[PDB]
Design a protein around this ligand. Structure first.
Ligand SMILES: O=S1(=O)CCN(Cc2ccco2)CC1
Length: 460
């Protein structure tokens, strides 16, 4: 039985509004309703992995797992295996996989982050799961961010706390947060960003939704505008939204948006909004294609509609050679030429690099770089031809061209990372000097850039 080089992944997010689900939820897992929907001819074809995020989930883990498994079994005639389940308060993540994948999945991790302080600590935060699928690392985050149209900056702070503090993936990748630890990272949930239009415009917004005219609403969606201004979710992707706002509905129908202020809402308006979202970030030049992104129309127990997204995702095999794992493959090498980091910092410490990759036996520390002043005020750290030659464990180009090098630039004085990025080895040529580039981030915000040239030697 050959190992796959692609899988499909289902991502669901549903804020259940503290109510039990209806008896049939299959439309969610079939990607049927409004938006980018899945073709009927695929209904019996199981996804490889199903990741279900709920918020305001009133069920026990047992109760929800039985509903999920019975749902998938009815659709596909396959009995899915539970990879992981993790709950923080009423925020939950379930990962299910086809039974044939059970011995392809390992290194399963779960964690949660509680956001806020005092008043604002006790119901918002995130849960996550990570694991390896053969040679590919996968991370999943379900977050319930702060509510309210006038709290976008709190949501952005919630995001940074979650990516800083959620402890998933390989703990040896110590300079890197979750935005660099995975081949593919999916971040979804009730992100709670709203359509920022005046309250007086509520009925006009409803009119537009009835006409399926979303453009003047999406141009005011806080998540898209905050992303465009680089305030949140830097270097993440989202499919185009072509489904109606998923919040706030009257329960038991989808015919009415319930937007007006009530004692139950703290006297806040809830204008129709795309609260419920799926975003992703994959390493450079790895295959990832969104094949559905939409909302169900027939699940009406909550004031939110469920959201689905599905993806093709490239995966690699657990490579063994005569040499690595457990030795190098002298036929292989990675050289950096003429590299420099440009940093936004005001500090004047010396800096060194760390190179991390599962194609190395362990991470590699560089010598300190040479600091110069840039023309427009910046710090330029030059490494010259001084960088250590990296010795991959396997030299086969079918393995090495699919790998990635994570880079951290660290202060000599504090050993703290001032920026993290990632370089793909999926090059146009081997034995050839080629330009490389990554932006550098720290705590998910832009801190600089790293650019230079690479020269990769494989056994071919
Ligand atoms: O780096 S990008 O692929 C990120 C997405 N966009 C920009 C964008 C549009 C809306 C919000 O942000 C193109 C460049």
């Amino acid at each position: 039985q050959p190992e796959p080089d692609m899988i499909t992944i289902f991502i669901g997010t549903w804020n259940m509004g503290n109510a039990p689900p209806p008896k049939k939820i299959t439309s969610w897992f079939l990607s049927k309703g409004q938006g980018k929907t899945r073709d009927d001819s695929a209904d019996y074809i199981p996804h490889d992995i199903y990741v279900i995020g709920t918020q305001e989930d009133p069920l026990s883990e047992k109760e929800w797992l039985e509903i999920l498994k019975h749902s998938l079994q009815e659709i596909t005639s396959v009995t899915f295996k539970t990879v992981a389940i993790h709950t923080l308060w009423n925020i939950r993540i379930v990962v299910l996989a086809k039974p044939e994948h059970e011995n392809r999945i390992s290194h399963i991790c779960t964690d949660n982050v509680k956001t806020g302080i005092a008043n604002t600590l006790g119901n918002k935060g995130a849960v996550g799961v990570s694991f390896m699928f053969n040679g590919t690392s996968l991370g999943f985050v379900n977050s319930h961010l702060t509510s309210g149209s006038e709290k976008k900056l709190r949501r952005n702070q919630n995001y940074m706390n979650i990516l800083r503090f959620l402890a998933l993936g390989d703990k040896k990748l110590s300079p890197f947060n979750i935005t660099h630890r995975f081949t593919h990272l999916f971040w979804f949930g009730d992100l709670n960003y709203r359509v920022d239009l005046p309250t007086w415009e509520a009925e006009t917004i409803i009119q537009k939704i009835k006409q399926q005219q979303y453009a003047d609403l999406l141009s005011h969606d806080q998540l898209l505008t905050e992303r465009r201004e680089q305030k949140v979710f830097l270097h993440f992707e989202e499919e185009e939204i072509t489904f109606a706002p998923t919040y706030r509905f009257e329960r038991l129908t989808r015919d009415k948006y319930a937007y007006t202020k009530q004692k139950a809402t703290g006297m806040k308006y809830n204008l129709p909004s795309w609260c419920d979202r799926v975003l992703w970030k994959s390493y450079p030049l790895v295959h990832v294609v969104c094949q559905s992104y939409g909302s169900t129309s027939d699940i009406m127990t909550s004031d939110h509609s469920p959201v689905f997204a599905t993806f093709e995702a490239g995966v690699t095999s657990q490579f063994v050679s005569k040499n690595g794992p457990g030795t190098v493959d002298s036929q292989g090498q990675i050289e950096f030429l003429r590299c420099y980091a440009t940093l936004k910092t005001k500090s004047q410490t010396k800096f060194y690099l760390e190179f991390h990759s599962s194609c190395l036996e362990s991470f590699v520390k560089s010598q300190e770089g040479e600091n110069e002043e840039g023309s427009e005020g910046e710090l330029v750290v030059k490494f010259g031809e001084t960088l250590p030659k990296l010795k991959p464990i396997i030299s086969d180009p079918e393995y090495l061209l699919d790998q990635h090098i994570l880079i951290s630039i660290k202060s000599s004085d504090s050993d703290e990372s001032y920026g993290e990025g990632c370089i793909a080895l999926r090059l146009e040529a081997t034995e050839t000097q080629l330009p490389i580039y990554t932006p550098l981030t720290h705590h998910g915000e832009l801190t600089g850039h790293f650019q230079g040239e690479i020269k990769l030697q494989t056994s071919q």
